[PDB]
Amino acid sequence: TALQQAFDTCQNNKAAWLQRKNELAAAEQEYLRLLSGEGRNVSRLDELRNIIEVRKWQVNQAAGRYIRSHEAVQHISIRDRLNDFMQQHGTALAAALAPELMGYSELTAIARNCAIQRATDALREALLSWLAKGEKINYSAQDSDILTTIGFRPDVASVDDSREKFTPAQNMIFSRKSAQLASRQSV
Amino acid sequence: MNLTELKNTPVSELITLGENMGLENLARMRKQDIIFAILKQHAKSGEDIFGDGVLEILQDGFGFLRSADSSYLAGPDDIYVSPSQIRRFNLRTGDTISGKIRPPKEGERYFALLKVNEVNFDKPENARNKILFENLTPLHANSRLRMERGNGSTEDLTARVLDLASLIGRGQRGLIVAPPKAGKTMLLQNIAQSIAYNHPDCVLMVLLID
Numbered sequence: 001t002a003l004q005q006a007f008d009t010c011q012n013n014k015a016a017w018l019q020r021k022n023e024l025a026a027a028e029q030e031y032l033r034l035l036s037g038e039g040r041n042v043s044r045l046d047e048l049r050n051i052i053e054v055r056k057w058q059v060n061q062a063a064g065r066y067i068r069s070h071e072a073v074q075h076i077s078i079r080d081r082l083n084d085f086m087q088q089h090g091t092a093l094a095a096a097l098a099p100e101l102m103g104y105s106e107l108t109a110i111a112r113n114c115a116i117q118r119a120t121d122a123l124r125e126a127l128l129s130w131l132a133k134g135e136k137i138n139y140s141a142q143d144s145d146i147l148t149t150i151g152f153r154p155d156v157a158s159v160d161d162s163r164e165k166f167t168p169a170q171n172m173i174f175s176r177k178s179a180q181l182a183s184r185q186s187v
Numbered sequence: 188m189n190l191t192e193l194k195n196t197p198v199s200e201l202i203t204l205g206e207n208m209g210l211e212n213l214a215r216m217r218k219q220d221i222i223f224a225i226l227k228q229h230a231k232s233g234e235d236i237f238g239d240g241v242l243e244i245l246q247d248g249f250g251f252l253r254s255a256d257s258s259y260l261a262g263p264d265d266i267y268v269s270p271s272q273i274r275r276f277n278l279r280t281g282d283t284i285s286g287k288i289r290p291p292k293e294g295e296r297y298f299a300l301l302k303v304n305e306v307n308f309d310k311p312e313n314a315r316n317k318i319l320f321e322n323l324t325p326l327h328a329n330s331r332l333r334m335e336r337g338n339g340s341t342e343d344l345t346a347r348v349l350d351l352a353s354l355i356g357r358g359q360r361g362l363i364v365a366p367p368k369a370g371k372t373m374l375l376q377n378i379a380q381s382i383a384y385n386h387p388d389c390v391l392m393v394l395l396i397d
């Protein structure tokens with residue numbers, strides 16, 4: 001029953017990323033408006049650039065967290081659908097894949113993983129041959145709504161904004177700057 | 188009138204205005220004595236007289252008020268301030284005080300402060316409930332203090348080099364070590380001009396010793 005909580009976490013991470021985008025855009029447009037002005041508020045421009053950098057780092061962090069939550073939701077949904085499909089067709093899969101399967105029951109770990117990789121390869125050609133027809137694949141019974149709301153893939157913005165990566169030094173400095181900005185906002 | 192404007196005026200027109208309205212001889216004594224005499228006569232006339240400056244508390248809790256124009260000399264025009272006013276309006280050392288002042292009478296020889304109209308550029312009652320400087324917790328420099336004028340001046344090069352050399356921000360504790368004949372004074376000139384141009388809101392002070 002953890003899939004509903006995972007879906008809620010993905011939703012709130014998406015909301016956080018969207019709101020991050022909103023104040024980033026607001027700060028960006030305000031900074032361009034101030035640049036268009038003729039005022040000599042150079043310190044204002046410098047602190048605006050600092051705000052832009054901090055908000056960009058926050059947006060990148062939120063996008064990364066949302067991507068991680070999306071991957072977790074997809075993984076748990078796949079696992080649950082796998083479990084309630086295998087609880088139905090386990091005997092049939094075992095009958096169709098028997099040799100290595102009762103090889104697993106008494107062979108050593110080397111033979112165990114050799115049989116494991118042989119079976120996974122065999123099913124790899126099985127899937128690549130089956131996908132020739134390529135009919136419209138539908139979702140599951142009760143997880144269809146969750147998979148539709150989450151979507152097949154995350155938004156293009158949430159993945160292209162995460163092209164840049166920060167080493168732990170940049171992560172630490174931007175965390176300190178974000179904490180300072182939070183203190184500034186609180187006061 | 189307000190003694191600040193007459194103090195800022197050079198000595199020539201001060202002398203001519205002293206002489207043109209009932210004075211005997213003002214040329215051959217100091218500017219402080221000239222100001223004291225004209226203030227005394229104008230107060231004897233009866234009109235309101237205004238003053239402002241920085242308060243100094245002596246070793247006995249006794250108050251003078253100096254002017255920044257005269258570089259805080261102990262001139263005769265410094266404003267008398269009794270300890271009673273210090274304890275009643277509850278000031279500090281170094282506050283900026285502006286208000287009506289009183290002509291001196293027998294027994295004293297500095298102008299007394301009648302009432303206060305502004306302390307540190309806000310309402311006098313708002314000054315009492317203020318937080319101490321030492322109680323403040325320090326931090327590091329956060330807001331960048333850019334040293335580039337941006338007008339593309341020929342000498343602005345020097346200031347530009349500063350932006351490439353060191354970072355200066357609000358609250359920064361800076362040192363400029365240099366042997367003689369190295370351009371320290373005009374480097375300070377450039378810094379002061381950059382502060383006055385780029386950041387006209389922050390208070391700028393330039394202190395010189397000997």
Ligand SMILES: Nc1ncnc2c1ncn2[C@@H]1O[C@H](COP(=O)(O)OP(=O)(O)OP(O)(O)=S)[C@@H](O)[C@H]1O
Nearest residue numbers: 342345365366367368369370371372373374375377
């Ligand atoms: N940016 C500059 N442009 C032109 N001349 C400069 C510049 N900086 C320094 N100088 C020259 O440096 C010489 C000394 O300048 P100062 O500022 O008086 O040196 P200083 O560091 O103040 O040492 P002091 O004050 O004599 S102890 C003068 O001949 C100036 O013309």
Ligand SMILES: [Mg+2]
Nearest residue numbers: 370371372373
């Ligand atoms: Mg010099």
